[PDB]
Design a protein around this nucleic acid. Structure first.
Lengths: 45, 96, 48, 106, 94, 48
RNA sequence: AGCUUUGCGCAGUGGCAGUAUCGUAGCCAAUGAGGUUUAUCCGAGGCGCGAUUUGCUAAUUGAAAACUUCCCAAUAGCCGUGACGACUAGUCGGCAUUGGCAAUUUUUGACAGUCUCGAGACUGG
């Protein structure tokens, strides 16, 4: 019984890994947070 | 389902009734003969009983009459090959 | 209807043909619990 | 391994049409699909020693964008005298069912 | 509960019975057996004996997919009847 | 390979639904039992 | 810089799914739907009609369940016998097929079980 849900364990690891991939890209890497915090704080004086 | 399909679904028990009482309805005393032999089947149908024609065609569909005759012929020759020498038979011949 | 599993037919349980027993009696079970003043409860519990 | 499957493939996609009228359609199918898009190769399976059509036919399209519109529009469309039924081609040959058997045990 | 006793046969019969594994004519008994078999020797179901008869009658057998299902079904019977408890005991590792 | 071909129901009101729900498996045999086996004793052991 | 709220979108774990989820082009609806509780109070959708894609796999019937078969003929150890051949009626080698190959020296089983520290003992009542 360990073999079939070991396959599906590798596949759900693939699935959770793909969720973490789609969160890994589109992440505001290190400075896109900085430019969006800037365009939040720097108004249109 | 449609009104015509409900009609046909209620005529289904007439089909099983006609097929049930077929040996005494489809005889020659009951309907004087205009004996139409059923196609690819050895049944004669005294009287146009179209419900019985549909039921007996659906029984003998896919050449069941010829398959019955072929199976009985080949099983009988299987019997005659099983009992060849102890009836003093040289061989059998399934005729063409 | 198959011969029910009698005490003279149970010897067929142990040949090579794999056989299961399905006991479904204990599937739906309850507990009936009283407190004296007020009312009485019946808790459905898990079964097998 | 029949030596005739190699006349359509250019990594192009094949639509499978079946339930076709065996009295006709030898080039009627080509005539009908030729309007979308251009010159292509569309065969009909007419078996030998008989000259009778086995039903099904394979129309190989250049695009899988072309394929979706063609499939959706000509599904059940009156062609010769029977409405065509459309599915995707199998081509389960040796080099893919060996891979399928290797994917079975994994 | 019966052991197959060494120097003894009858305990094996009491085991297998428990397990349920059991014109001037010639003048003679013609033991007609009418039996339907495939090429492998298996005793054939009358539905599939009629199917073999009708394949030979119509001259057109099954397609490829139904022969795949039928052949894989026969070796499913062969693989089943030639025989996870030990794997369950080894997993019960915890 | 691990599916059974003979299933024995302890309680007699289950072989008739088992006939209905196992028409995908006509290879299996659903018989009743004259001997009932106390699998509520499995409930009584603390582990199960 | 970190925390965090709200709304929306994406994916994931789980749960639910015919008193559930929706469509509404027909009408009505914050210019108030719908209100028996608390009514000089509450505040959101309501009534009808109409519904609830796709891929994979299994199983059944059926002749056939849709991806480019059956049949006939022949070929693929020894003891005897027949010729051919070789060597002196006998012997030997190869070839061929017109009977046989479970009764002590072989190929149709004196084997099987037990016990003791590579070696022996016991039983087959």
């Amino acid at each position: 019984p360990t073999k079939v849900e070991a396959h599906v364990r590798a596949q759900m690891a693939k699935r959770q890994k793909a969720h973490e991939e789609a969160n890994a890209a589109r992440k505001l890497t290190a400075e896109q947070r900085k430019v969006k915090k800037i365009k939040k704080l720097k108004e249109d004086i | 389902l449609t009104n015509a399909q409900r009609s046909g679904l209620n005529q289904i028990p007439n089909r099983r009734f006609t097929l049930w009482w077929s040996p005494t309805i489809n005889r020659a005393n009951v309907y004087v003969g205009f004996q139409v032999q059923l196609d690819l089947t050895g049944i004669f149908m005294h009287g146009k009983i179209p419900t019985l024609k549909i039921s007996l065609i659906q029984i003998f569909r896919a050449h069941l009459w010829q398959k019955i005759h072929e199976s009985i012929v080949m099983d009988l020759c299987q019997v005659f090959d099983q009992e060849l020498d102890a009836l003093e038979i040289e061989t059998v011949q399934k005729e063409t | 209807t198959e011969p029910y599993l009698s005490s003279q037919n149970y010897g067929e349980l142990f040949s090579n043909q794999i056989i299961w027993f399905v006991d479904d009696t204990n599937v739906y079970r309850v507990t009936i619990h009283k407190t004296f003043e007020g009312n009485l409860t019946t808790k459905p519990i898990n079964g097998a | 391994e029949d030596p005739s499957l190699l006349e359509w493939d250019a990594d192009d996609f094949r639509i499978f049409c079946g339930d076709l009228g065996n009295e006709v359609n030898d080039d009627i199918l080509a005539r009908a699909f030729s309007r979308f898009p251009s010159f292509l190769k569309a065969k009909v399976i007419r078996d030998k020693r008989t000259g009778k059509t086995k039903g099904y036919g394979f129309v190989s399209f250049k695009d899988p964008s072309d394929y979706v519109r063609a499939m959706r529009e000509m599904n059940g469309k009156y062609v010769g005298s029977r409405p065509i039924k459309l599915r995707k081609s199998m081509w389960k040959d040796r080099n893919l069912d060996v891979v399928r058997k290797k994917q079975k045990e994994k | 509960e019966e052991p197959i006793v060494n120097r003894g046969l009858a305990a094996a019969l009491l085991l297998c019975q428990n397990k349920g594994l059991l014109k001037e004519k010639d003048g003679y008994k013609p033991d007609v057996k009418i039996e339907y078999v495939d090429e492998t020797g298996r005793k054939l179901t009358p539905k599939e004996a009629f199917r073999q008869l009708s394949h030979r009658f119509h001259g057109k057998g099954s397609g490829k997919m139904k022969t795949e299902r039928r052949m894989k079904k026969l070796d499913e019977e062969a693989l089943l009847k030639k025989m996870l408890g030990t794997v369950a005991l080894l997993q019960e590792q915890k | 390979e691990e599916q059974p071909k003979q299933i024995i129901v302890t309680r007699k009101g289950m072989l008739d639904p088992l006939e209905v729900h196992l028409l995908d498996f006509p290879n299996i045999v659903i018989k009743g039992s004259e001997l009932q086996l106390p699998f509520q004793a499995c409930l009584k052991v603390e582990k199960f």
